[PDB]
Structure 1
Amino acid sequence: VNVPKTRKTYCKGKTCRKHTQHKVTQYKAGKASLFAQGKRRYDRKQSGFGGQTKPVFHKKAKTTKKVVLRLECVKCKTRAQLTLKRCKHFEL
């Protein structure tokens, strides 16, 4: 399935209320954080005693969970993502 990568629709995050042009986009990436809970426990030496269970390798998930259709408003900065329906192969 493909949702279009721009539609006009209702003003979802109701900063206008009345219907506007939205832009259907996706999020960013940047650094690696470093200060984050499992990263603080991992390279330290923790999980206490018991193995090398110091928060380990790949903590995973499956193929496509939901789809990233973020409806950015043209008035404010406001974001709306809903419960988005599924796809097996999407592109932006």
Structure 2
Amino acid sequence: VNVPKTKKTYCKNKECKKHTLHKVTQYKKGKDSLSAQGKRRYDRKQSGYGGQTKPVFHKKAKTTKKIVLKLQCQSCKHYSQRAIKRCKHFEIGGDKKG
């Protein structure tokens, strides 16, 4: 899977609302905040005795992840995000087919 470095698709911003040229990057998960209410509630739940209080997943079967593309149009500098089919090897702006 090779993806172009730029792409012209619809932009839904109220200042664009049309096809514009977009910049194509890849999504990566932001690092978890310690002050998210879920994190807070869990840390309170873990304190003291009783051990592990929430389940811990073990049974991994998926060997891939759906790749997300972060498309930034070059007129308002707002992003859209679209997921593509699961792939093992992925590349943006790689060398073209012959």
- TM-score between both structures, scaled by the size of structure 1: 0.62
Q: 1:69: how far off?
A: 1.2
Structure 1: stretches of 5+ with no match in the other structure = none
C-alpha distance in 1, partners of 2:85/2:4? 13
C-alpha distance in 1, partners of 2:4/2:59? 29
Q: Greater strand percent: which structure?
A: 2
Deviates more, 1:74-83 or 1:9-18: 9-18
The corresponding residue for 1:52 is 51
Sequence identity percentage:
58
* CA-based RMSD: 3.6
1:1-80 alignment runs, 5 A limit: 1-7=1-7, 9-14=8-13, 15-27=15-27, 32-44=32-44, 46=45, 51-55=50-54, 62-80=62-80
Counterpart secondary structure, 2:71: strand
C-alpha distance in 1, partners of 2:17/2:35? 39
- TM-score between both structures, scaled by the size of structure 2: 0.59
Give yes or no for contact 1:39–1:55 (8 Å, CA) kept in 2: no
Q: 1:74: how far off?
A: 1.1
Q: 1:72: how far off?
A: 0.6
